Amino acid sequence: KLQDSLDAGVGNLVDADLAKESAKLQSLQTKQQLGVQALSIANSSSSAILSLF
Amino acid sequence: KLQDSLDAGVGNLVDADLAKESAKLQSLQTKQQLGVQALSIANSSSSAILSLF
């Protein structure tokens, strides 16, 4: 019983809660796509000046 | 006879009614599956915003 409680305690110390990581994963994938889109918007600022010339 | 009645009384105090636990077990397994499905629905809320960009 003592060996089982030491192993369960190690699990309390280091194990991930995977049900919570699933939510973090989905939101982070959406954030990465929005970040690529925002960088694409920032890249195009120079093209606006071409119209004046 | 007194020893048998003391042992039966301990059983009245602590024993589980397993026919009732079988119903609780089945309903709880269904509830766990529905909870995983509900968490899966909640995880997907961010993906709706990607359409606007």
PDB file of C-alpha atoms in Angstrom, chain A residues 19 22-23 26-27 30 33-34 37, chain B residues 39-40 43-44 46-47 49-50 53:
ATOM      1  CA  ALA A  19      -9.133  17.079 -20.705  1.00  0.00           C
ATOM      2  CA  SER A  22      -7.687  19.540 -25.270  1.00  0.00           C
ATOM      3  CA  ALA A  23      -9.360  22.923 -24.797  1.00  0.00           C
ATOM      4  CA  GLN A  26      -8.079  23.940 -29.917  1.00  0.00           C
ATOM      5  CA  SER A  27      -7.947  27.566 -28.837  1.00  0.00           C
ATOM      6  CA  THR A  30      -7.338  29.063 -33.772  1.00  0.00           C
ATOM      7  CA  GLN A  33      -4.399  30.877 -37.715  1.00  0.00           C
ATOM      8  CA  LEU A  34      -5.489  34.365 -36.666  1.00  0.00           C
ATOM      9  CA  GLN A  37      -3.835  36.360 -40.900  1.00  0.00           C
TER      10      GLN A  37
ATOM     11  CA  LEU B  39     -16.718  19.202 -23.389  1.00  0.00           C
ATOM     12  CA  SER B  40     -16.029  18.468 -27.044  1.00  0.00           C
ATOM     13  CA  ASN B  43     -13.890  23.154 -27.102  1.00  0.00           C
ATOM     14  CA  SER B  44     -15.024  24.120 -30.600  1.00  0.00           C
ATOM     15  CA  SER B  46     -13.189  29.374 -30.969  1.00  0.00           C
ATOM     16  CA  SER B  47     -13.328  27.817 -34.431  1.00  0.00           C
ATOM     17  CA  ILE B  49     -14.620  33.009 -35.186  1.00  0.00           C
ATOM     18  CA  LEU B  50     -12.177  31.897 -37.897  1.00  0.00           C
ATOM     19  CA  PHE B  53     -11.420  36.556 -40.933  1.00  0.00           C
TER      20      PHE B  53
END
